Design an enzyme around this catalytic site. Structure first.
Site, PDB file in Angstrom:
ATOM      1  N   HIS A  41      50.128   1.213  53.180  1.00 29.29           N
ATOM      2  CA  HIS A  41      51.500   1.001  52.322  1.00 29.29           C
ATOM      3  C   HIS A  41      50.566  -0.519  51.765  1.00 29.29           C
ATOM      4  O   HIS A  41      51.985  -1.155  51.285  1.00 29.29           O
ATOM      5  CB  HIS A  41      52.357   1.701  53.229  1.00 29.29           C
ATOM      6  CG  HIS A  41      52.613   0.703  54.208  1.00 29.29           C
ATOM      7  ND1 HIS A  41      52.617  -0.768  54.151  1.00 29.29           N
ATOM      8  CD2 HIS A  41      52.622   1.494  56.008  1.00 29.29           C
ATOM      9  CE1 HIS A  41      53.047  -1.057  55.329  1.00 29.29           C
ATOM     10  NE2 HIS A  41      53.246   0.037  56.798  1.00 29.29           N
ATOM     11  N   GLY A 143      56.290  -7.254  58.945  1.00 26.88           N
ATOM     12  CA  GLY A 143      55.269  -8.272  58.758  1.00 26.88           C
ATOM     13  C   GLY A 143      54.208  -7.935  59.999  1.00 26.88           C
ATOM     14  O   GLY A 143      53.223  -8.739  59.770  1.00 26.88           O
ATOM     15  N   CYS A 145      53.336  -4.532  60.237  1.00 28.99           N
ATOM     16  CA  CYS A 145      52.486  -3.755  60.407  1.00 28.99           C
ATOM     17  C   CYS A 145      51.309  -4.393  60.072  1.00 28.99           C
ATOM     18  O   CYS A 145      50.388  -5.296  60.162  1.00 28.99           O
ATOM     19  CB  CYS A 145      52.768  -3.202  58.971  1.00 28.99           C
ATOM     20  SG  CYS A 145      54.308  -2.227  58.723  1.00 28.99           S
TER      21      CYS A 145
END
Ligand SMILES: CC(=O)CCn1nc(Br)c(Br)n1
Ligand SMILES: [Cl-]
Ligand code: NA
Lengths: 301, 306
Positions: A41, A143, A145
């Protein structure tokens, strides 16, 4: 003596963390050999969140659309592919710090360490378990991820989790390193909700065995139980079913302490009925379920 | 969202851990520049440990009686000396992995990460607080002596603890990296006991702020209090006194959440006097006191250590 939620030393994973930027979006990537793994993503825009077509978004990208920064150094992306929900960026440098490693998909109840990271830089390390509802109860800010979960059995790092998203109840969802989500979740911002969560029974029993090993017996009793009667009681407290697999797994701890597995189940039944009456077990006033049988043997003994 | 007991990344310290053997004793050492630090009781037989004369015991050891292995390479010890309760082994090679570091002595109530090690090999990392009674509630088995505790500031590792011994209650005692013990303990096999411990009030307050930030608010109430009134309650419940400096330190969290410290003290007073009534806070039925105000701000702000 003592008993602590203990993480694996993080150094072998620290040397693999990089920053991946695509458009205005920055998150973390995992650099092993000449490949950087990150959540797919990262290629979504603000209009893509609800129903992204990742194949269509990805075909529009060139290698140079991906900025990968390892410490102070830009890596050159020389290829890209998608595998399930992870992006694999081929880079022109093999990571000289690549540890011995493998990718392992774990089952509910398994524990692992999380190296929380922001902008490719590690922030902290903590211990997690895969809940029965396939979420994890982590600590993740915007942040984070691309932060990963791992075990280190014998200098080989088993990567088992990559962080993708936070669900509305504040728990977290992610994939294995082959990009397959744990549980029914998808990398879309369409409404999704974790199932009702339950207590990891085999882990609570392991931790009770830990308490005995470290010298605490106050919660035992003179009773035993059949496996079926135990499960009938425990499910009324939202405990997971205990299987014969679990009973077998607890054999070693039962032999070390002298307490039969079904006798320990009878102690657990009473604790659910009575509470702790102002006492603690291994410093907790609640029954702890994020230590596995394997964890207990490794930390105690 | 979420709040977990969180250690610093341990990689910078892992590259400094070595194995130190003297006679039949193997334990862990810390290799920084060209010196390896380890507990001076490495030189004692079990006989010696009953009443050691460390200067006398060390006279008889040559450099070659100190076997130091960094991974699979042996290090050549070329000198040895004591500083308080730590032994300093000068070696012939500077550690190429030496991080930017300093030796600091911490205050009770402050937290640090422990890198638990065996045979020079790091095995686990966890977060500890220095208790008011100067022990730590660690998890250590035989062979863990010389494991170290630390914080990281920027790229600087502040080493604050080296593990020496376990007390009969199962808690742990050690020194700073200059060999000064935390607490009234000595490195000798003699009768020693942890003193009565107390709860770290400013840390409990910090953790309640962490809970509010994470949406756990049921314990908030309309009341406030005074320092003197609250401190009478804290004394009654074996909590450490709350000082004005504590209140100042929590200032940021008070402004961020809208709950003044003495406002939050009134919550804590009511929790002490009445319990939790079957409820939990950040998943705990006990009041947690091993997060400092700095810990809470950092974890609720995402500070990093590349
Ligand atoms: C800004 C965010 O919330 C994270 C980005 N993101 N896109 C998707 Br699709 C998902 Br799931 N998470
Ligand atoms: Cl598994
Ligand atoms: Na109040």
């Amino acid at each position: 003596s003592g008993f602590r939620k203990m993480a694996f030393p993080s150094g072998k994973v620290e040397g693999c963390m990089v920053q991946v930027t695509c458009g205005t979006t920055t998150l973390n990537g995992l650099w092993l050999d000449d490949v950087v793994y990150c959540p797919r993503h990262v290629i979504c825009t603000s209009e893509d969140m609800l129903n992204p077509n990742y194949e269509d978004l990805l075909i529009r990208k060139s290698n140079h659309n991906f900025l990968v920064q390892a410490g102070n150094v830009q890596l050159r992306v020389i290829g890209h592919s998608m595998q399930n929900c992870v992006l694999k960026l081929k880079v022109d440098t093999a990571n000289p710090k690549t540890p011995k490693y493998k990718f392992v998909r774990i089952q509910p109840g398994q524990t692992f360490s999380v190296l929380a990271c922001y902008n490719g830089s590690p922030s902290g390390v903590y211990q997690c378990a895969m809940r029965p509802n396939f979420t994890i109860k982590g600590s993740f800010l915007n942040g984070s991820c691309g932060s990963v979960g791992f075990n280190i059995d014998y200098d080989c790092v088993s990567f088992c989790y990559m962080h993708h998203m936070e669900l509305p109840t504040g728990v977290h969802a992610g994939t294995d390193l082959e990009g397959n989500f744990y549980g029914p979740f998808v990398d879309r911002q369409t409404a999704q909700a974790a199932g009702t969560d339950t207590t990891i029974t085999v882990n609570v029993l392991a931790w009770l065995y830990a308490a005995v090993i470290n010298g605490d017996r106050w919660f035992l009793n003179r009773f035993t139980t059949t496996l079926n009667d135990f499960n009938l009681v425990a499910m009324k407290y939202n405990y997971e079913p205990l299987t014969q697999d679990h009973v077998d797994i607890l054999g070693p701890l039962s032999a070390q302490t002298g307490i039969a597995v079904l006798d320990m189940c009878a102690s657990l039944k009473e604790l659910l009925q009575n509470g702790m009456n102002g006492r603690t077990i291994l410093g907790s006033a609640l029954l702890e379920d994020e230590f596995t049988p394997f964890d207990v043997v490794r930390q105690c003994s």
